[PDB]
Amino acid sequence: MSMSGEVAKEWQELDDAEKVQREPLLTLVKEIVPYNMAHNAEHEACDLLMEIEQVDMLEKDIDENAYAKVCLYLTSCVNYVPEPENSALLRCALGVFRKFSRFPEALRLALMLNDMELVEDIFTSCKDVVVQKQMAFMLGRHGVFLELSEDVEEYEDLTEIMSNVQLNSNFLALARELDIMEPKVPDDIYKTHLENNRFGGSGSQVDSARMNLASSFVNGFVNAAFGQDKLLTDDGNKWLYKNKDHGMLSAAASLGMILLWDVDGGLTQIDKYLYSSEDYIKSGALLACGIVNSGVRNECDPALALLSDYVLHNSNTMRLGSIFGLGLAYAGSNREDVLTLLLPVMGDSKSSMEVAGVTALACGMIAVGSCNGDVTSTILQTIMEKSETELKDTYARWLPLGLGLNHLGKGEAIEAILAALEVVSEPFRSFANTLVDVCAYAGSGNVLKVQQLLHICSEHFDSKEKEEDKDKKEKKDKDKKEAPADMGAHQGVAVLGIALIAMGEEIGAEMALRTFGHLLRYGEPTLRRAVPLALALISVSNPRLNILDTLSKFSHDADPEVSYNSIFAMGMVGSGTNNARLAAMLRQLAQYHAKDPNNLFMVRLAQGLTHLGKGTLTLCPYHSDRQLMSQVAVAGLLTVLVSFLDVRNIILGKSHYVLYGLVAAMQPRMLVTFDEELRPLPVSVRVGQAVDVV
């Protein structure tokens, strides 16, 4: 009309079309164009508020986006009956997409405040009540796909519309950086479970149909996968050739080729150091001396004869790393040894773990992918033979570590038959027992297991085991963010909070500094001892700046418990990378007059942060470590703990053969370490020995 072209700036030209609507429709834009086109005129962009409605009801598109650039406000609420709204919206939806990519092949828009803000402003009313399937699927822009999603359970969002691989590359690329902040990631195919054939089908079809360029992500995947479940489900999903793919599968030739690849870049000394220790016969530790030959040899049989013949003496726990190496040697590739590995179990009433439980743990831990499927039913039947003599405590600690590792969704439930012995009622031993016992059984994920086991075990309640039971419910769901909602209780036991922030939060960026810092500053005394224990998870990002800084002030504390748990919190998460500040820090640490294992546990475990499975040939020389262990063993004089540390540094020093890395770069976590890193926090006598298996 003639009012929009008025020289007067008096408000307003907005919403005036609502009063008189059908009557102005008899005119056209021919009267509007001289006002907006001619410069030096009043109400240039102000007339766009009335013009945007005229071009909206006429179904014309790409004109509405240009007139809404200045407005940015009234686009939200615009004239209401939903029928013309959802009509003109769907017609504009299908009508805007055809106005783009008409060149063809981009140039892409050109997140700009014009299109992205407008499509989102209307998307609010779109996602509010009516219709469905907005322009986010039609346009193809991945930026609007980020705003397309609304808060919902993402377990059903793993499916997407199929398209060409060219667009699927950038699709999954921006979807990856979108899901790194979200609990669920495109890499969830590892953890999930799921377990349906879909993840194995799409996982095997990602390289389809090319069989040449597919050498990566397939061959490297099957030889880097320790579990057989992947090489099982993907074997049924592997369509290449016929039936003959089993040669590279089963982790037979896989472990066989990568072992020789580790021998190439190796290797660890065998005759020199171990015969020199043979002239020293048996060390007084009876602790770490067995796990040496486990990783070392691998594969040689003659030393295995000395292993078994010695440990037939049954003295203490020394059989641990030896009988572990009994199976580990032959199992280094495949199958192996599973026949005579379980024979000493029933052969050696235990009556404890250090006697007959060693070889009973062997078949479980050395398995690594078996099942197969005889190992499953064999272990279940073997543990069903001996019940009252195990019984509920010492051996039940290590047993679940041979099941939930290989298969989290295994149908066979050993938890029930192993929980029938819980009547022992012992409050002390059951803490470290029932902790990982119930934690290492399975990953669960159905939410029914926690309700079942809570109702039938408690009954009542145990007043103690329920602590670690809710921690199992927290460990069940992986970084689902429900853990900060489950910490509202905050019981005086406080063991809930440390494990809740540690396990309940797993993400690339730390982001936990506010809560981890809040629990230590607001927590009660003596709780600060167990606070640093969360460092084994969230510190994998940048441990160099945060770890040595913080723990520096706590490493000088006179309390042995907090000192034990300080160097422990650093532990493995800080042993991946080296530095001179660590090597220069090693001074004055071993010169302290303090007794107890905490001193040589502080220093010797700190020696293991120089490298992991690296050397010595290639690369770092071993003579420096030999001089350090020789000069540090002259004190006390025994104090046989110096004979514990001189074998301790060569545990990870001279084993090599395993790159970790972290474990792991694929982001599984080691299910032995953590469990074993939990128990010695109060290490009195023998519990730090079950942690030597490392």
Partner 1 sequence: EEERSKVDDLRGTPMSVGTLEEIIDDNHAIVSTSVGSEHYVSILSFVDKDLLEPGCSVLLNHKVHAVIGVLMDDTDPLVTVMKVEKAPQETYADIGGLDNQIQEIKESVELPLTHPEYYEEMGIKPPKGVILYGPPGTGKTLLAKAVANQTSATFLRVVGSELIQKYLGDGPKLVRELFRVAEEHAPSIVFIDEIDAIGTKRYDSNSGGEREIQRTMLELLNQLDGFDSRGDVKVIMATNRIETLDPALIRPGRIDRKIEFPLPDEKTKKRIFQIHTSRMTLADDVTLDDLIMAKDDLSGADIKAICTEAGLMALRERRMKVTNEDFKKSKENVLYKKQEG
Binding site for partner 1 (CB under 8 A): 579-581, 584
d(CA 158, CA 184): 9
Q: How many residues does the chain have?
A: 694
**Is residue 466 within 8 Å of 458, Cβ to Cβ?**
yes
To partner 1, the closest distance from the beta carbon of 2 in angstroms equals 25
Q: Burial level of 203, CB count in 10 A (0-12/13-18/19+)?
A: middle
To partner 1, the closest distance from the beta carbon of 580 in angstroms equals 3
Region for 106 from its dihedrals, namely left if φ exceeds 0, alpha if ψ lies in -120 to 50, beta otherwise: left
Pick the closer one to partner 1 by CB: 36 or 433: 36
**Is residue 237 within 8 Å of 201, Cβ to Cβ?**
yes
Pick the closer one to partner 1 by CB: 377 or 579: 579
To partner 1, the closest distance from the beta carbon of 584 in angstroms equals 6
- State the Cα angle at 658 between 656 and 664, rounded to 5°: 140
Residue 154 per-residue DSSP state: G
d(CA 546, CA 373): 45
To partner 1, the closest distance from the beta carbon of 110 in angstroms equals 12
**Is residue 465 within 8 Å of 498, Cβ to Cβ?**
no
Pick the closer one to partner 1 by CB: 81 or 584: 584
Pick the closer one to partner 1 by CB: 40 or 132: 40
Pick the closer one to partner 1 by CB: 70 or 417: 70
Pick the closer one to partner 1 by CB: 581 or 595: 581
Pick the closer one to partner 1 by CB: 246 or 581: 581
To partner 1, the closest distance from the beta carbon of 113 in angstroms equals 11
| Residue 116: how many other CB atoms lie within 10 Å | 16
The secondary structure of 546-567, three-state, reads HHHHHHHHHHCCCCHHHHHHHH
To partner 1, the closest distance from the beta carbon of 184 in angstroms equals 32
Pick the closer one to partner 1 by CB: 163 or 579: 579
To partner 1, the closest distance from the beta carbon of 579 in angstroms equals 5
To partner 1, the closest distance from the beta carbon of 574 in angstroms equals 15
Burial state string for 417-450 with b = 16 or more CB within 10 A and e = fewer than 16: ebbeebeeeeeeebbbbbbbbbbbbbbbbeeebb
To partner 1, the closest distance from the beta carbon of 583 in angstroms equals 9
To partner 1, the closest distance from the beta carbon of 582 in angstroms equals 9
Pick the closer one to partner 1 by CB: 161 or 580: 580
C-alpha 117: how far from its chain's center? 36
Pick the closer one to partner 1 by CB: 45 or 493: 45
**Is residue 383 within 8 Å of 414, Cβ to Cβ?**
yes
Pick the closer one to partner 1 by CB: 71 or 694: 71
d(CA 365, CA 340): 15
The secondary structure of 5-52, three-state, reads CCCCCCCCCCCHHHHCCCCHHHCCCCCCHHHHHCCCCCCCCCCHHHHH
Query: Could you give the C-alpha distances from 371 to 10, 255, 323, 374, 381, in angstroms and in order?
Result: 83, 18, 20, 6, 13
To partner 1, the closest distance from the beta carbon of 544 in angstroms equals 9
Two tokens at 441?
A: 């059984």
